[PDB]
């Protein structure tokens, strides 16, 4: 059978879309006949009406995702897959005889901040998993905690944290390293040759189940290594519990990460508070169509300790949840300390727990929070708005899309496409256009975002059947 609610909602979406098309073509024909102030006023009233109409269609699509048991099914399937992957990682990480285990050695001390260093460990872990090597994490003299990883997180194994082997060598590829018991992996920036066990590909054995359950299987797969790595020590778990209570952290909330200080001009622009808060307001308008919004609440994470005062002053209708001493702790004077380490971990935790995330994906901090968010919901792939980049994993293989409809360029800034063309995406301008390279032409420019599909890449990974 099909579900009655499913059929009602599908037809309501289709009728809602058709009515939006009738409304668009009528109101745009009217706009053409106006000028100056009447044109401004008409356009503004039109945008307000379109926002409500658009949000009704998105609300119906949310209900369609849940109806007739689909929500319960998605939650059960996502749980089954996480448990499966976590069991395979635990099995890899816990050989019975550490002496005789194949191993991959990772050093945490890359020359960068916490999110960049966590992503380096994820990259090491994913290649460990692909090559059937126990991950050994070397973390003495960590700039955030001289005592290492186990200052905050559980060790990465219970049975095998020792580097002993009959042979050691620097990574030279799976074929040359086949009989080398312990391989040392460099940073992805220096890795040659590259093995296939890198983002944004996903394991061939899971790909059908992942595409069915999740809008971005690449992030979900990265998130399973993040989930395993950041298992907290009991003292940190107690600190998060009591932080939750003391901050009055509560739902609904929108996470906002504002990255300023040394990021600006090197790796990102300065974005004013108003640019984040436009998307927070829009998302609360959407949530209010399907739930009670007690108070509009924002969890603010920032390395600018003057921002919180600014935000409260400009948005007195909003409840801001923030630890301003964490913001202070993140300045360049204090950043590489255990105090600042606990601060970034807490900010990332609360961001990742929010209903929605507004930030710059140019920041490794926001990307870690978005990856953790994937572990907390069946499919949180769409629960963000980036002011700059799309999701990426530094060191990833080429992010390709496939043109599904033809594009004839209207300006020289646009690229042509025919269906089938491989597009290397550089980003989404959040205005209906993306920028990328039509591979076949080597032309870079703009294309309508709706005219491409994501190319899921799969890789033959080990499946660790003895983990069952
Ligand atoms: C030695 C050492 O320790 N080095 C560390 C270093 O590892 C560490 O991390 C690096 O930080 C910089 C952040 O500055 C990262 O640079 C940014 O990388 C992204 C992602 O690029 C990949 O994916 C995109 C699609 O999202 C794609 O277009 C790219 O080509 C690229 O894919 C590549 O394909 C190859 C095929 O084999 C692979 O071999 C490569 O591995 C793969 N590359 C990577 C890096 O994975 C990129 O999007 C960013 O570019 C934007 O930002 C810069 C400014 O920083 C602008 O100059 C660019 O024009 C572009 O701007 C964007 O343009 C879009 C389209 O118009 C807009 O929509 C966006 O809004 C706008 N964005 C911005 C911010 O303006 C950067 O290139 C690098 O990935 C990090 N690497 C790792 C491993 O973590 C840094 C951390 O600070 O410390 C060093 O010390
Ligand atoms: N507590 C806290 N620290 C931050 C914040 N934003 C930046 N930082 C600090 O600055 C570092 C920036 O390095 P990294 O995490 O690699 O991210 P990126 O430079 O933003 O891409 C973080 O790891 C923190 O140490 C924040 O919102 N809160």
Author numbering: 107 to 574
Give sentences copied directly from the paper behind this entry:
However, the lack of solved ternary complexes has impeded to obtain mechanistic insights into the glycosyl transfer reaction or reveal the molecular basis of the requirement for a terminal GlcNAc moiety on the α1,3 arm for optimal catalysis. Here, we have captured a ternary complex formed between the human FUT8 (HsFUT8), GDP and the biantennary complex N-glycan G0 (see below) by X-ray crystallography, uncovering the molecular basis of FUT8 catalysis and recognition of acceptor substrates. The resulting crystals allowed us to solve the structure at high resolution (1.95 Å) and interpret the density map. The asymmetric unit (AU) of C2 crystals contains two molecules of HsFUT8 that are arranged as dimers with two molecules from the neighboring AU by direct contact between their corresponding N-terminal coiled-coil domains. The structure also reveals that GDP is partly buried and located exclusively in the catalytic domain, while the inner part and the α1,3/α1,6 arms of G0 are located in the catalytic domain and the exosite formed by the loop β10–β11 and SH3 domain, respectively. Residues 428–444 (formed by a loop and α10) experience a large conformational change (the largest distance, close to 22 Å, was observed for Gly437 in both forms) that allows the partial closure of the GDP-Fuc-binding site and which protects the more hydrophobic part of the molecule (the guanosine moiety) from the solvent. Furthermore, the loop β6–α8 (residues 365–378) is partly disordered in the apo form and suffers a conformational change in the presence of both ligands, leading to an ordered loop that contributes to the formation of both the GDP-Fuc and the acceptor binding sites. The guanine moiety of GDP establishes CH–π interactions with Ala436, Val450 and Val471 while the guanosine moiety is tethered via hydrogen bonds to Tyr250/His363/Asp453 side chains and Tyr220/Thr408 backbones. The glycerol moiety is a fucose mimic that occupies a similar position as found for fucose, and further interacts with Arg365 and Glu373 side chains, and AG0 OH6, the site of fucosylation in G0. In particular, Arg365, Lys369 and Glu373 contribute not only to the binding but also to catalysis, with Glu373 acting as the catalytic base for AG0 OH6. However, the terminal GlcNAc moiety in the α1,3 arm, EG0, is the most intimately recognized monosaccharide residue of all branched sugars.
